[PDB]
Design a protein around this nucleic acid. Structure first.
Lengths: 109, 171, 197, 136, 106
RNA sequence: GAACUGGCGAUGCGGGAUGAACCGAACGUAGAGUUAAGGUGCCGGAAUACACGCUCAUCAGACACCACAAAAGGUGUUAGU
RNA sequence: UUUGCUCCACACAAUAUAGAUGGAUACGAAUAAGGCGUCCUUGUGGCGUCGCUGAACCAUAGCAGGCUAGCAACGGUGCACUUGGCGGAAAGGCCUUGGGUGCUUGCUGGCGAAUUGCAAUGUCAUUUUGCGUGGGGAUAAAUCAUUUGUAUACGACUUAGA
């Protein structure tokens, strides 16, 4: 459904296996190789919300075990590729933000 | 506008009493072909008994400058109409090509005598091949040996509306 | 880009500075203008004195108290020139004009802050060398401002204190530049130089 | 004693003066002034940098402190030969003006990972400099 | 860190207008940093949010948002034209406003 | 007071600050784009654009209709014969 | 006037915002001249360097930024104190001494984050007021009415009265 499968990895910055919209990301020039990861398991039916009825109203106020060992399988294959070039773990752990004087039409990502 | 020079060659329409008319040629500074042909017919109506309905134009060709990177001195002879009469002037311009020289000539006449394009007639323009035939001091000033001069008081235009230091006009 | 912009009014042209500043206020930038006694007006001092006398003639005939008020301070002259360019009779104009305060000299809220200039309103960048100009403090004390000398004395005291500040600042920055030069040509310095810093 | 004046020299325009094109189609290259048209415009040529031989207004160029020998009205083969002989391109490159230009375009060409890297390196350099700022 | 801004600041200047007739359907936005239409062409199609506060809590918040987008450039100095779902209330002339980086082309 | 035409009267809209007649253009209700006449320092939407000159006024000048100035002069300054 | 008034701390409400979202980052003067460094005979001095914009400089990694372990230094920074100054133009701020305490991403590790489901400002600021606590602080005047006549159309003014 025209979505991008992404991961943090979850060990680095706490972002799980997820899908995002391609119009809501910035493709940086930083590139790592993801060969050696078996992502053909995931599809549109892998992420189902189990839609809620109108009667169940949350007045005041969990995770799939299949999802958590799938995350643990993929992220240990990603971090082995991360350890080759230096400072990528720190780069992926740090957040992105615009400082004073940053012009996004002049910035290269 | 930005001027170009054309040769325009035309003649009268051929009749049985006289075929092959004499094929007059003129050099016109104009913005384009339409203005060039209009000025050609204007000056031929000033010279000979012909008009556009009675004649035709056999050729129009752009004449670009032979050496566009040689610095020349041109002497220009001009008629212009003032508010009270008609006068002849001779002005000389140091510049790199004929079309740019007549562009600065039109600007100079419009600036110094308020003469418009409709009032200025270009009699002729010719390169002065020898120095000391230059007769105006404002162009003879730039012909001296080892000419050099400074440019005092540099003003640099800024992109920001606020500057964070007092600017300098050193050059 | 800034919360408050402090403009040193020295050497500026009155109309060009006012047309910059009025657009800044209407866009929503807070402006404070200091040293209003050192503004410049192009033209002879006698021409601008004659202009102010022509303005000073104009008053309401049946009651002078409701007429045009002829303010004499240089800051209020600048305020007049700027209120001419802001549509002050509307709520948007009033909200714009309350983002502005103009002073003679540099008061103690702003003597420790950073002063900027407007290069498209500076006299040395705008006028041809040779044209004559005026000083707004001289014109204003010619037409009736009473406080030209007390501002001069306060400005002399402030400049003495500021030079005492600047000597210490220069000594500290020479120490920092010396330490940066001696701590350069290390591996982190060469990597930063390769990366552009 | 002896008479003292402040000389106040600045950057004469003459033949052989090296200029930097400020704006236009070249916009940042070097040229050499071949001849002087009038007070406001000159004929320049920039044959090593690919600037064509042209007349140009003096407000579109910036004069550099570099000068070399040319006769007036020299054609582009002689201009290129004297430019290579005087070797003014690396003499321009050795200046802090050209280093500032190169620094500006390098900082423009940095990416986000390189910006993270310069932040880490600047933190390390700041640590060692502020450690040096405790003994003097 | 200490900064978390993922948008570009801008100012709501005015409506689209002639000398004496304004048009509230199109607003004029000064994005900071851009000073030419060629640099302003990067920001076309980006979402704009005007974020303001109110005293009365409506659905868990006292902060209300008005959404819009950049449509075209305006003039020679990098001002852009913006259209919103409901037009901006015209007391916000000079108010700050947020230009987000989505929908991104990079 | 007449001749030919176009208008106003009978007609709003953009421009000329303002105005029956001028310039542009004639009108169902809306959306998008492009313009006319007029403009782009600020009021005020839009270049404190670019280029060549001229002018310093102890009443400068700043745009058709249009809201005025002449004869005569000036080693002021510029360009010419 | 039945326990009122002010200040301090947080506790909850209400009230709005001309419009935070890394930092308003301090010589003066000249511009047909300067700034900085250095040297000397200290000057309107000699020598070197810089500008050509802030496209800078500083800051900037961590759950909107967690919980822990170690290394290297004796630095950097925040908070409440504390010593000494300076600042009256609208000072209400700037500098400094000492100790405490927390953090340190200068360097190397360990654990956590998901489900806000493909975005929804996704809520983190400061402005005023009230009501509670519990801890200090202090115990007035003005007006009407009477009177005066230096005042006066009436108000107002000037006087007096435990």
């Amino acid at each position: 459904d025209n979505t991008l499968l992404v991961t943090g990895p979850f060990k680095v910055n706490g972002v799980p296996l997820r899908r995002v919209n391609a119009r809501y990301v910035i493709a940086t020039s930083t590139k790592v190789s993801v060969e050696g990861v078996n992502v053909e398991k995931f599809n549109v039916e892998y992420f189902a919300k189990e839609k809620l009825t109108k009667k169940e109203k949350k007045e005041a106020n969990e995770i799939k075990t299949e999802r958590v060992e799938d995350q643990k399988v993929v992220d240990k294959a990603l971090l082995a590729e991360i350890k080759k070039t230096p400072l990528l773990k720190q780069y992926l752990s740090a957040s992105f933000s615009l400082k004073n004087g940053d012009k996004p039409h002049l910035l290269k990502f | 506008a930005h001027f170009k020079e054309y040769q325009v060659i035309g003649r009268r329409l051929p009749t049985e009493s006289v075929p092959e008319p004499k094929l007059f040629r003129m050099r016109i500074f104009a913005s384009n072909e339409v203005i060039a042909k209009s000025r050609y017919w204007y000056f031929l109506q000033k010279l000979h008994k012909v008009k556009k309905a009675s004649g035709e134009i056999v050729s129009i060709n752009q004449i670009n400058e032979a050496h566009p990177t040689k610095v020349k001195n041109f002497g220009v002879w001009v008629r212009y109409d003032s508010r009270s009469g008609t006068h002849n002037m001779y002005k000389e311009i140091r510049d790199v090509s004929r079309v740019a020289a007549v562009e600065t000539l039109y600007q100079d006449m419009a600036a110094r005598h308020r003469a418009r394009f409709r009032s200025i007639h270009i009699l002729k323009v010719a390169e002065i091949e020898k120095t000391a035939d230059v007769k105006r001091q404002y162009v003879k000033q730039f012909l001296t040996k080892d000419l050099k001069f400074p440019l005092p008081h540099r003003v640099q235009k800024s992109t920001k509306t606020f500057s964070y230091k007092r600017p300098s006009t050193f050059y | 880009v800034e919360p408050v912009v402090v403009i040193d009014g020295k050497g500026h042209l009155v109309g060009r500075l006012a047309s910059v500043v009025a657009k800044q206020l209407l866009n929503g930038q807070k402006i404070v203008v200091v040293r209003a006694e050192e503004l410049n007006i192009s033209g002879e001092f006698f021409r601008n004195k004659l202009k102010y006398h022509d303005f000073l003639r104009k008053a309401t005939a049946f009651n002078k108290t409701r007429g045009p008020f002829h303010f004499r301070a240089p800051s209020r002259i600048f305020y007049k020139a700027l209120r001419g360019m802001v549509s002050h009779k509307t709520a948007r104009g009033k909200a714009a004009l309350e983002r502005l305060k103009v002073f003679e000299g540099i008061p103690p809220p702003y003597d420790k802050k950073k002063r900027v200039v407007v290069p498209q309103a500076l006299r040395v960048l705008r006028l041809k060398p040779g044209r004559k100009y005026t000083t707004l403090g001289k014109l204003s004390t010619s037409v009736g401002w009473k406080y030209e000398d007390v501002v001069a004395k306060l400005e002399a005291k402030r400049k003495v204190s500021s030079a005492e500040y600047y000597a210490k600042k220069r000594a500290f920055t020479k120490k920092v530049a010396s330490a940066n030069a001696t701590a350069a040509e290390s591996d982190v310095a060469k990597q930063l130089a390769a990366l552009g810093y | 004693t002896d008479s003292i004046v402040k000389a106040s020299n600045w950057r004469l325009v003459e033949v052989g003066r090296v200029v930097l094109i400020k704006k236009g189609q070249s916009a940042g290259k070097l040229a050499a002034i071949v001849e002087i048209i009038d007070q406001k415009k000159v004929l320049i040529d920039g044959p090593k940098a690919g600037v064509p031989r042209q007349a140009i207004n003096l407000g579109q160029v910036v004069l550099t402190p570099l000068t070399f020998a040319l006769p007036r009205g020299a054609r582009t083969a002689t201009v290129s030969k004297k430019w290579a002989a005087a070797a003014v391109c690396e003499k321009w490159a050795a200046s802090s003006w050209a280093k500032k230009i190169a620094q500006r375009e390098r900082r423009a060409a940095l990416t986000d990972f390189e910006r993270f890297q310069v932040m880490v390196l600047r933190k390390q350099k700041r640590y060692t400099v502020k450690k040096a700022l405790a003994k003097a | 860190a200490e900064s978390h801004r993922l948008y570009v600041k801008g100012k709501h200047l005015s409506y689209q207008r002639s000398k004496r007739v304004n048009n509230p359907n199109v607003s004029l936005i000064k994005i900071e940093g851009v000073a030419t239409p060629q640099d302003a062409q990067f920001y076309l199609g980006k979402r704009i949010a005007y974020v303001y506060r109110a005293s009365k809590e409506v659905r868990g918040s006292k902060i209300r948002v008005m959404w819009g987008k950049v449509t075209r450039t305006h003039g020679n100095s990098g001002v852009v034209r913006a259209t919103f779902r409901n037009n901006l209330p015209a007391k916000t002339f000079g108010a700050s406003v947020r230009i987000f980086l989505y929908p991104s082309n990079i």
